[PDB]
mmCIF file of C-alpha atoms and ligand atoms in Angstrom:
data_model
loop_
_atom_site.group_PDB
_atom_site.id
_atom_site.type_symbol
_atom_site.label_atom_id
_atom_site.label_comp_id
_atom_site.label_asym_id
_atom_site.label_seq_id
_atom_site.Cartn_x
_atom_site.Cartn_y
_atom_site.Cartn_z
ATOM 1 C CA UNK A 1 15.993 58.319 24.248
ATOM 2 C CA UNK A 2 16.089 55.497 22.000
ATOM 3 C CA UNK A 3 17.314 57.660 18.782
ATOM 4 C CA UNK A 4 21.303 56.772 19.022
ATOM 5 C CA UNK A 5 20.498 53.681 15.794
ATOM 6 C CA UNK A 6 19.792 56.928 13.433
ATOM 7 C CA UNK A 7 23.434 57.841 14.377
ATOM 8 C CA UNK A 8 24.859 59.804 11.123
ATOM 9 C CA UNK A 9 28.856 60.887 10.653
ATOM 10 C CA UNK A 10 28.682 64.638 10.265
ATOM 11 C CA UNK A 11 31.694 66.406 8.993
ATOM 12 C CA UNK A 12 32.232 70.369 9.109
ATOM 13 C CA UNK A 13 32.229 72.333 5.351
ATOM 14 C CA UNK A 14 35.173 74.816 5.301
ATOM 15 C CA UNK A 15 33.694 76.749 2.823
ATOM 16 C CA UNK A 16 30.986 77.912 5.027
ATOM 17 C CA UNK A 17 33.071 78.625 7.796
ATOM 18 C CA UNK A 18 33.705 82.337 9.042
ATOM 19 C CA UNK A 19 36.992 83.029 8.019
ATOM 20 C CA UNK A 20 38.183 83.207 11.864
ATOM 21 C CA UNK A 21 37.279 79.526 12.528
ATOM 22 C CA UNK A 22 39.791 76.559 12.560
ATOM 23 C CA UNK A 23 38.370 73.237 11.704
ATOM 24 C CA UNK A 24 40.419 70.012 12.186
ATOM 25 C CA UNK A 25 41.907 67.892 9.438
ATOM 26 C CA UNK A 26 39.331 65.131 10.201
ATOM 27 C CA UNK A 27 36.627 67.933 9.820
ATOM 28 C CA UNK A 28 35.326 66.972 13.090
ATOM 29 C CA UNK A 29 36.372 69.776 15.365
ATOM 30 C CA UNK A 30 36.307 73.444 15.238
ATOM 31 C CA UNK A 31 37.466 76.262 17.043
ATOM 32 C CA UNK A 32 37.690 80.210 17.054
ATOM 33 C CA UNK A 33 41.099 81.393 16.225
ATOM 34 C CA UNK A 34 42.726 84.731 17.441
ATOM 35 C CA UNK A 35 42.779 86.133 13.851
ATOM 36 C CA UNK A 36 41.629 85.739 10.173
ATOM 37 C CA UNK A 37 42.807 82.217 9.303
ATOM 38 C CA UNK A 38 44.254 83.379 5.850
ATOM 39 C CA UNK A 39 41.207 82.113 3.698
ATOM 40 C CA UNK A 40 39.361 83.751 0.511
ATOM 41 C CA UNK A 41 36.013 85.346 1.139
ATOM 42 C CA UNK A 42 33.252 83.420 -0.783
ATOM 43 C CA UNK A 43 29.414 84.090 -0.859
ATOM 44 C CA UNK A 44 28.662 81.012 1.833
ATOM 45 C CA UNK A 45 30.756 81.991 4.638
ATOM 46 C CA UNK A 46 29.028 83.616 7.569
ATOM 47 C CA UNK A 47 30.337 86.713 7.688
ATOM 48 C CA UNK A 48 29.061 88.335 11.277
ATOM 49 C CA UNK A 49 29.201 85.536 13.495
ATOM 50 C CA UNK A 50 31.772 82.267 14.426
ATOM 51 C CA UNK A 51 29.130 79.830 12.601
ATOM 52 C CA UNK A 52 29.828 76.709 10.269
ATOM 53 C CA UNK A 53 27.487 74.222 8.592
ATOM 54 C CA UNK A 54 27.862 70.527 8.204
ATOM 55 C CA UNK A 55 28.481 68.920 4.599
ATOM 56 C CA UNK A 56 25.702 66.688 4.680
ATOM 57 C CA UNK A 57 22.187 67.465 3.527
ATOM 58 C CA UNK A 58 18.842 65.838 4.761
ATOM 59 C CA UNK A 59 15.541 66.376 3.117
ATOM 60 C CA UNK A 60 13.819 62.978 4.548
ATOM 61 C CA UNK A 61 14.146 60.562 7.313
ATOM 62 C CA UNK A 62 15.571 60.276 10.704
ATOM 63 C CA UNK A 63 19.014 61.701 11.757
ATOM 64 C CA UNK A 64 20.936 61.533 15.111
ATOM 65 C CA UNK A 65 24.278 62.806 15.904
ATOM 66 C CA UNK A 66 26.142 64.027 19.192
ATOM 67 C CA UNK A 67 28.238 67.713 19.856
ATOM 68 C CA UNK A 68 31.175 67.993 22.528
ATOM 69 C CA UNK A 69 30.637 71.390 24.413
ATOM 70 C CA UNK A 70 32.999 70.694 27.207
ATOM 71 C CA UNK A 71 34.263 74.075 28.905
ATOM 72 C CA UNK A 72 32.651 76.207 26.861
ATOM 73 C CA UNK A 73 30.680 79.722 27.788
ATOM 74 C CA UNK A 74 28.978 80.153 24.522
ATOM 75 C CA UNK A 75 27.903 78.253 21.503
ATOM 76 C CA UNK A 76 24.738 77.560 19.310
ATOM 77 C CA UNK A 77 23.990 74.082 18.291
ATOM 78 C CA UNK A 78 21.033 72.485 16.136
ATOM 79 C CA UNK A 79 19.839 72.577 12.226
ATOM 80 C CA UNK A 80 19.226 75.374 9.597
ATOM 81 C CA UNK A 81 17.812 75.368 6.208
ATOM 82 C CA UNK A 82 20.486 75.313 3.370
ATOM 83 C CA UNK A 83 19.090 78.584 2.093
ATOM 84 C CA UNK A 84 19.555 80.888 5.399
ATOM 85 C CA UNK A 85 21.133 84.037 4.910
ATOM 86 C CA UNK A 86 24.986 84.066 5.510
ATOM 87 C CA UNK A 87 25.896 87.903 5.394
ATOM 88 C CA UNK A 88 25.031 90.716 7.856
ATOM 89 C CA UNK A 89 23.153 90.254 11.170
ATOM 90 C CA UNK A 90 20.200 88.176 11.825
ATOM 91 C CA UNK A 91 18.585 86.418 14.797
ATOM 92 C CA UNK A 92 18.346 82.447 15.327
ATOM 93 C CA UNK A 93 14.487 81.658 14.740
ATOM 94 C CA UNK A 94 12.373 79.318 12.802
ATOM 95 C CA UNK A 95 10.921 82.191 10.910
ATOM 96 C CA UNK A 96 14.805 82.782 9.407
ATOM 97 C CA UNK A 97 15.382 78.627 8.789
ATOM 98 C CA UNK A 98 17.285 77.475 12.368
ATOM 99 C CA UNK A 99 16.194 75.045 14.788
ATOM 100 C CA UNK A 100 18.580 75.927 17.624
ATOM 101 C CA UNK A 101 19.474 75.891 21.170
ATOM 102 C CA UNK A 102 22.423 77.977 22.895
ATOM 103 C CA UNK A 103 24.255 78.860 25.791
ATOM 104 C CA UNK A 104 24.681 82.386 27.041
ATOM 105 C CA UNK A 105 25.726 84.125 30.136
ATOM 106 C CA UNK A 106 25.000 81.007 32.523
ATOM 107 C CA UNK A 107 21.649 80.255 30.661
ATOM 108 C CA UNK A 108 20.393 77.774 28.177
ATOM 109 C CA UNK A 109 17.584 78.853 25.817
ATOM 110 C CA UNK A 110 16.016 77.880 22.725
ATOM 111 C CA UNK A 111 15.859 79.830 19.558
ATOM 112 C CA UNK A 112 12.238 80.478 19.364
ATOM 113 C CA UNK A 113 11.177 84.086 18.864
ATOM 114 C CA UNK A 114 11.103 85.368 21.426
ATOM 115 C CA UNK A 115 13.586 82.516 22.755
ATOM 116 C CA UNK A 116 12.649 80.059 25.405
ATOM 117 C CA UNK A 117 14.014 79.467 28.900
ATOM 118 C CA UNK A 118 15.220 75.756 29.216
ATOM 119 C CA UNK A 119 15.359 74.066 32.739
ATOM 120 C CA UNK A 120 18.679 72.109 32.767
ATOM 121 C CA UNK A 121 19.894 70.846 36.407
ATOM 122 C CA UNK A 122 23.109 69.151 35.048
ATOM 123 C CA UNK A 123 25.384 71.270 32.782
ATOM 124 C CA UNK A 124 25.610 69.367 29.716
ATOM 125 C CA UNK A 125 29.483 68.153 28.521
ATOM 126 C CA UNK A 126 27.574 66.428 25.205
ATOM 127 C CA UNK A 127 24.256 67.276 23.720
ATOM 128 C CA UNK A 128 22.354 64.961 21.127
ATOM 129 C CA UNK A 129 20.304 66.444 18.164
ATOM 130 C CA UNK A 130 17.663 64.420 16.529
ATOM 131 C CA UNK A 131 15.837 65.429 13.466
ATOM 132 C CA UNK A 132 12.756 63.533 12.132
ATOM 133 C CA UNK A 133 12.008 65.241 8.892
ATOM 134 C CA UNK A 134 8.850 63.828 8.014
ATOM 135 C CA UNK A 135 7.348 64.231 11.048
ATOM 136 C CA UNK A 136 8.879 68.065 11.595
ATOM 137 C CA UNK A 137 10.686 67.384 14.914
ATOM 138 C CA UNK A 138 14.151 68.611 16.361
ATOM 139 C CA UNK A 139 14.931 67.444 19.663
ATOM 140 C CA UNK A 140 17.963 67.996 21.872
ATOM 141 C CA UNK A 141 19.448 65.649 24.757
ATOM 142 C CA UNK A 142 21.525 65.892 27.621
ATOM 143 C CA UNK A 143 24.117 63.102 27.104
ATOM 144 C CA UNK A 144 25.689 63.938 30.312
ATOM 145 C CA UNK A 145 22.407 63.397 32.189
ATOM 146 C CA UNK A 146 21.350 59.740 31.033
ATOM 147 C CA UNK A 147 19.842 61.222 27.513
ATOM 148 C CA UNK A 148 17.258 63.660 29.503
ATOM 149 C CA UNK A 149 15.109 65.905 27.155
ATOM 150 C CA UNK A 150 16.179 69.465 26.623
ATOM 151 C CA UNK A 151 13.778 70.562 24.149
ATOM 152 C CA UNK A 152 11.425 69.692 21.130
ATOM 153 C CA UNK A 153 10.374 71.858 18.184
ATOM 154 C CA UNK A 154 7.391 70.278 16.619
ATOM 155 C CA UNK A 155 5.250 71.472 13.678
ATOM 156 C CA UNK A 156 8.642 72.497 12.148
ATOM 157 C CA UNK A 157 8.202 74.229 8.515
ATOM 158 C CA UNK A 158 11.589 73.079 7.277
ATOM 159 C CA UNK A 159 10.906 74.527 3.609
ATOM 160 C CA UNK A 160 14.250 72.897 2.224
ATOM 161 C CA UNK A 161 17.073 70.613 2.762
ATOM 162 C CA UNK A 162 18.731 70.785 6.218
ATOM 163 C CA UNK A 163 22.385 71.281 7.176
ATOM 164 C CA UNK A 164 23.629 70.844 10.948
ATOM 165 C CA UNK A 165 24.616 74.266 12.347
ATOM 166 C CA UNK A 166 27.180 75.378 14.713
ATOM 167 C CA UNK A 167 28.334 78.519 16.277
ATOM 168 C CA UNK A 168 31.375 78.412 18.776
ATOM 169 C CA UNK A 169 30.669 81.496 20.029
ATOM 170 C CA UNK A 170 32.991 84.694 20.396
ATOM 171 C CA UNK A 171 35.446 84.688 22.977
ATOM 172 C CA UNK A 172 35.959 88.082 24.315
ATOM 173 C CA UNK A 173 36.394 86.856 28.073
ATOM 174 C CA UNK A 174 39.230 84.348 27.369
ATOM 175 C CA UNK A 175 37.089 81.657 28.919
ATOM 176 C CA UNK A 176 34.977 80.504 25.511
ATOM 177 C CA UNK A 177 38.367 79.312 23.227
ATOM 178 C CA UNK A 178 37.352 75.615 23.467
ATOM 179 C CA UNK A 179 36.334 74.072 20.390
ATOM 180 C CA UNK A 180 32.968 72.229 19.749
ATOM 181 C CA UNK A 181 33.438 68.490 18.838
ATOM 182 C CA UNK A 182 31.527 65.819 16.890
ATOM 183 C CA UNK A 183 31.704 62.702 19.195
ATOM 184 C CA UNK A 184 32.213 59.072 17.794
ATOM 185 C CA UNK A 185 29.482 56.765 16.764
HETATM 186 O O1 LIG B 1 34.601 90.958 14.642
HETATM 187 C C1 LIG B 1 35.183 89.725 14.657
HETATM 188 N N1 LIG B 1 35.535 89.210 15.979
HETATM 189 C C2 LIG B 1 36.644 88.553 16.458
HETATM 190 C C3 LIG B 1 37.492 89.003 17.490
HETATM 191 O O2 LIG B 1 36.800 89.892 18.348
HETATM 192 C C4 LIG B 1 35.973 90.671 18.159
HETATM 193 C C5 LIG B 1 34.729 89.879 16.982
HETATM 194 N N2 LIG B 1 35.067 88.816 13.967
HETATM 195 C C6 LIG B 1 35.196 89.147 12.667
HETATM 196 C C7 LIG B 1 33.514 88.769 12.021
HETATM 197 C C8 LIG B 1 32.962 87.478 13.012
HETATM 198 C C9 LIG B 1 33.945 86.748 13.728
HETATM 199 F F1 LIG B 1 33.678 85.523 13.994
HETATM 200 C C10 LIG B 1 35.258 87.466 13.958
#
């Protein structure tokens, strides 16, 4: 791909984080803590899952960023509406305002309803995310495999401002403690 020139500097919004998350001082890394992180509750925090939003809001144009997923067993990545549900149980789908992919139990899937099997020969260590607001496109790229396409959501109906979306996943296995990291430009 040739989307790298739309690179944007994403930072994580502490106020939206699940209360177990630990966000680095530079707001560029997030991981699952082993306990509640001693923060107050608020209506923005994702309550049921280890999720957090980027601070940036996008309503036009083309945007690109990269995320490091090295040695994780489970995670979700993509974008979502600013107005997504924060409390209780929900599925990741475009109907619920999410455009995402994930790793779970050794398979990669796109967050359609129902979910779509992805075909990845080279397990990625870094993921590129491209959003074209006007075109209604969200695309995912395998940076480990020379930028190869993973998945494109087209005919997207954003229906609001978009925020970068992250899920570090649970760590029931003891093998998923590693952080998500926003990679430098
Ligand atoms: O219930 C948990 N868990 C963490 C410990 O392991 C069990 C699952 N929480 C609270 C709700 C959302 C979270 F991210 C963390």
